[PDB]
Design a protein around this ligand. Sequence first.
Ligand SMILES: [Zn+2]
Length: 140
Amino acid sequence: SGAIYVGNYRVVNRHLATHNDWANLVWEDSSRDLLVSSTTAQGCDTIARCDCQTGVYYCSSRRKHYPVSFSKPSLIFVEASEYYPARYQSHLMLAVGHSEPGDCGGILRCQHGVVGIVSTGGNGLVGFADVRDLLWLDEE
Ligand SMILES: [Zn+2]
């Protein structure tokens, strides 16, 4: 689990979105595994605006933050998990590292802020859903 709280936005994995999230929907995209809902309270997470390929992510299944190198956001074939079939996922970045389904929502951060959240796992890779292209999270 986990989320990003920026301005009056909550960013979660689409597959973990709650009724309240859908009842306050701003934007969602299945192909990216992202959903954004509106919040009453102001959040303070800063979204990275950059092309960094190094950062640190939180892995709940190890109670650890790991420094990683990661690929640029791309359309990648993802093998079946507990929560999605085998399919193409867009805006996905991969690193060498540990990721189990419960790790989804863990933040990847660089020197500029939040890069994305854990979305995929398996075969010794961890996949992150990028948010750095979502420039509207910073406004309204
Ligand atoms: Zn950065």
